[PDB]
């Protein structure tokens, strides 16, 4: 029995590594029925193709859509919200690093999906924007229209902050939110320095630049 139990342990660990060995240092995302875009391994090529910039004072973007729809335009709006959540939610958080993006599929017969925008100002109520695409406009255009609406709503909600200085303070003190994202850095570089090697890096701190080894001058001469 113990032999088969150890074999089971080995197989379980092997599959868990094959799934998460290059992503073991990252936290795990939510296991919701709309957050399938968080467990997939995102190509850095797609992440570079889709670079969305939202207002820095925004903190959360949620996209709620319904599972089943009884109306044709309701099903169309649900598909639009699903496509937007699968296309731009991960790029937004990956390129902003201060916003938390989440999508969810409510198991109900609704025909109007929506998006919720939360700002860094706790004293400011969140905003709700419905997904109401034009029947004549295609899905590829409706997704871009929803993205435009979301970006403009984020801009308005960030500009309508109560105390911009306090908002900047809480932004500077807030940690990173996209630590769960599984990015496959393909031929670009395993390290940010390897990625930006084609550029001159002027932003460095001498405390970290200074080598902290014995005979560091000898080693620097050998390296140079």
């Amino acid at each position: 029995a113990q032999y088969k139990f150890i074999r089971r342990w080995e197989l379980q660990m092997r599959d868990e590594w094959d799934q998460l060995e290059p992503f073991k240092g990252l936290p795990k995302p939510k296991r919701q029925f709309g957050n399938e875009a968080a467990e997939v391994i995102w190509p850095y090529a797609l992440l570079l193709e889709r670079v969305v910039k939202v207002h820095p004072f925004t903190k959360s973007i949620y996209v709620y859509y319904a599972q089943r729809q009884s109306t044709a335009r309701g099903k169309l709006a649900a598909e639009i919200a699903r496509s937007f959540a699968r296309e731009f939610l991960i790029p937004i958080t990956f390129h902003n690093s201060q916003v938390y993006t989440e999508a969810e599929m409510l198991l109900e017969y609704s025909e109007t999906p929506w998006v919720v925008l939360h700002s860094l100002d706790n004293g400011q109520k969140p905003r709700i924007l419905p997904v109401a695409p034009v029947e004549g406009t295609p899905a590829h255009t409706a997704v871009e229209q929803l993205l435009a609406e979301v970006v403009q709503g984020c801009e308005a909600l960030g500009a309508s902050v109560a105390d911009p200085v306090t908002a900047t303070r809480v932004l500077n003190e807030r940690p990173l939110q996209n630590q769960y994202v599984r990015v496959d850095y393909q031929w670009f570089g395993d390290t940010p320095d390897e990625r930006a090697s084609h550029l001159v890096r002027w932003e460095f701190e001498p405390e970290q630049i200074e080598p902290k080894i014995r005979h560091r001058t000898r080693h620097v001469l050998d390296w140079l």
Partner: protein, 37 residues
């Protein structure tokens, strides 16, 4: 097509003994302000 766990699949071959069952059992004062009315 959506979440496969939510997607329904049929059970053509199922064992009566395959069912599993287990039994487990579950294991400030304040001040009173007075206002004359």
């Amino acid at each position: 097509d959506g979440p496969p766990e939510l997607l329904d699949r049929p059970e053509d071959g199922w064992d009566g003994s395959e069912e599993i069952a287990l039994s487990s059992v579950a294991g400030x004062x304040x001040x009173x302000x007075x206002x004359x009315x």
